[PDB]
C-alpha cells in the first residue's frame, strides 16, 4: 500500500549507465524507500534523485510511514 521506509546504505553502489533506472548512493547515506516486497527497491535520495536500488546493499532503519 502507501508505506515509505527509511534505509541506511551498508556500502556504496554505483549504478550502471546501461541500466538507467538504477541510482547510485554512498555508504551510510540515508534513503527513503518503498515497494520493499521484492529484491530491488524504489529509492529517493536527499538530492531528489529517484530510481531503484539493490536491497542487499541497505538496512531498514525506520518506517512504515504514510
Amino acid at each position: 500500500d502507501n508505506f515509505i521506509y527509511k534505509a541506511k546504505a551498508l556500502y556504496p553502489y554505483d549504478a550502471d549507465d546501461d541500466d538507467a533506472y538504477e541510482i547510485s548512493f554512498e555508504q551510510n547515506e540515508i534513503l527513503q524507500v518503498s515497494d520493499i516486497e521484492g529484491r530491488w527497491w524504489k529509492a529517493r535520495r536527499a538530492n531528489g534523485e529517484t530510481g531503484i536500488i539493490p536491497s542487499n546493499y541497505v538496512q531498514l532503519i525506520d518506517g512504515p510511514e504514510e
Binding site: 556500502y11 556504496p12 553502489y13 541500466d19 529484491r39 530491488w40 539493490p54 536491497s55 542487499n56 546493499y57
Partner: peptide, 9 residues
C-alpha cells in the same frame, strides 16, 4: 534481475 554481489567485507 539478480542482485549484485555484496562488496568486500
Amino acid at each position: 534481475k539478480p542482485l549484485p554481489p555484496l562488496p568486500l567485507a
